[PDB]
């Protein structure tokens, strides 16, 4: 499978989530995603074929994970934008007020701005601390998907937010959306991962 930020992947032939970012760990290929997507060893599939299993995750508390993939996957320094792509250039954290976009299998590519840092999400499972808040919309399915600036700076992966009865926060005004993402920095250090860039 070609590994691109934003594309769909299923877990144990059940849940769906989105690919975050292609990364490496020595000779091991992987992608970073949201922890809530799977438990250690769940099987990840792309378009019906096995690609890898979850190597590690933390959820709740934090919301992060990395899937290690078989050698046959092709890692790419790109994030899906319709039929186009955003090249991953690095991971400089943008500040409050920066514009940002996110890519996911449910709502496609959405942009907005970062409105707050260090927010706690009270999920049914337990609190999730230190998330950054953006106002780009998202829907069930987007989780684990990429948050990136137009300039190609990777920000994090989609955790959650205030989904309305229609499964997203797209029908409510930007000012009322709270779309939360887990910062990429600490996921990269925690697991010793390197981002694939172009």
């Amino acid at each position: 499978a070609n590994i691109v930020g934003g594309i769909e992947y299923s877990i144990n032939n059940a849940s769906l989530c989105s690919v975050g970012f292609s990364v490496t760990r020595g000779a091991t290929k992987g992608f970073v995603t949201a922890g809530h997507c799977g438990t250690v060893n769940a099987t990840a599939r792309i378009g019906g074929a096995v690609v890898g299993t979850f190597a590690a995750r933390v959820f709740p508390g934090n919301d992060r994970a990395w899937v290690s993939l078989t050698s046959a996957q092709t890692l790419l320094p790109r994030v899906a934008n319709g039929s186009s792509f955003v090249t991953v250039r690095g991971s400089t954290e943008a500040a409050v007020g920066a514009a940002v976009c996110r890519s996911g299998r449910t709502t496609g590519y959405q942009c907005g701005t970062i409105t707050a840092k260090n927010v706690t999400a009270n999920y049914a499972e337990g609190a999730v601390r230190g998330l950054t808040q953006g106002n780009a919309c998202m829907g069930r399915g987007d989780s684990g998907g990429s948050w990136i600036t137009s300039a190609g700076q990777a920000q994090g992966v989609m955790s959650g937010g205030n989904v309305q009865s229609n499964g997203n926060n797209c029908g409510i005004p930007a000012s009322q959306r709270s779309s939360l993402f887990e910062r990429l920095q600490p996921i990269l250090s925690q697991y010793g991962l390197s981002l694939v860039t172009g």
Partner: peptide
């Protein structure tokens, strides 16, 4: 808020 909910995860996703």
């Amino acid at each position: 808020a909910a995860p996703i």
